[PDB]
């Protein structure tokens, strides 16, 4: 593939997921690349009924960015402490090697704003030869 995720999927590293989720109230859960689409899920702490969960993504080293709405997905077996939101983002026909593709996650609820920015580095998608 000419594109890989430059980070481990948090759902495969539960101890790291749990720490970040408890601290930030939002954390990326799944992320995968298939056929120039990036898809995944986000877990949020259930602090209010109405929620706005977005991926903020750049394809040009933050010269510009797009906010993409995530969609609530009820788990029939889920609890009430957290909620899961999905996203699906089509990638550009070609992506840069000289610029960076990076994203982070925002969560608006209860008059508060929470973010997952991967410890200040954002989540990077890198090119492969
Ligand atoms: O019935 C009481 C309820 O009535 C009013 O709410 C109605 C609202 O005004 C309508 O617009 C519509 O809701 C739509 C909504 O406006 C849209 O934005 C969208 O909603 C999405 C959410 O934004 C998104 O967060 C997610 O929602 C899921 C939650 O994430 C998840 O946690 C769970 O929600 C449960 C709450 O966590 C829990 O607290 C409890 O909610 C109570 C509220 O806290 C309380 O304020 C009151 O709610 C009023 C509301 O204020 C009125 O405006 O009572 C609630 C019940 O006790 O229970 C929640 C449900 O289990 O689940 C939700 C998904 O159901 O996804 C949604 C969907 O995309 O779409 C909404 C639906 O069209 O209808 C509601 C009434 O149903
Ligand atoms: Na919403």
Residue numbers in the entry: 132 to 260
Passage from the reporting paper:
Dephosphorylation of both enzymes is exerted by protein phosphatase 1 (PP1), a pleiotropic phosphatase involved in the regulation of cell growth and protein synthesis, other than glycogen metabolism. PP1 is directed to its different pathway-specific substrates by scaffold proteins; PPP1R3 are those orienting PP1 towards GYSs and PYGs. PPP1R3C (317 amino acids), also named protein targeting to glycogen (PTG), is ubiquitously expressed. PTG is composed of 317 amino acids with a structured central region, containing a carbohydrate-binding module 21 (CBM21, residues 133–261), flanked by largely disordered regions.
We determined the crystal structure of the PTG CBM21 in complex with β-cyclodextrin in two different space groups at 1.5 and 2.0 Å resolution. The domain is organized in a β-sandwich of eight antiparallel strands (β2-β9) divided into two β-sheets, with an overall immunoglobulin-like fold. The four chains (one in the orthorhombic crystal and three in the asymmetric unit of the monoclinic system) are identical with an average rmsd of 0.36 Å (over Cα atoms). In the PTG CBM21 crystal structure, the β-cyclodextrin molecule binds at the interface between symmetry-related copies occupying site I in one chain and site II in the other. In site I, half of the cyclodextrin molecule lies on the shallow tray generated by the β4-β5-β8-β9 sheet together with the β4-β5 and the β9-β10 loops. Major van der Waals contacts are with Arg187, Trp193, Tyr196, Cys235, and Trp246 together with H-bonds directed to Arg187, Asn248, and Asn253 side chains. The observed interaction at site I configures then as a crystallographic interface or as an ancillary carbohydrate-interacting site, which binding to glucose chains is cooperatively reinforced by the dominant interaction at site II; while site I shows some sequence divergence, all site II residues are conserved in PTG, GM and GL.
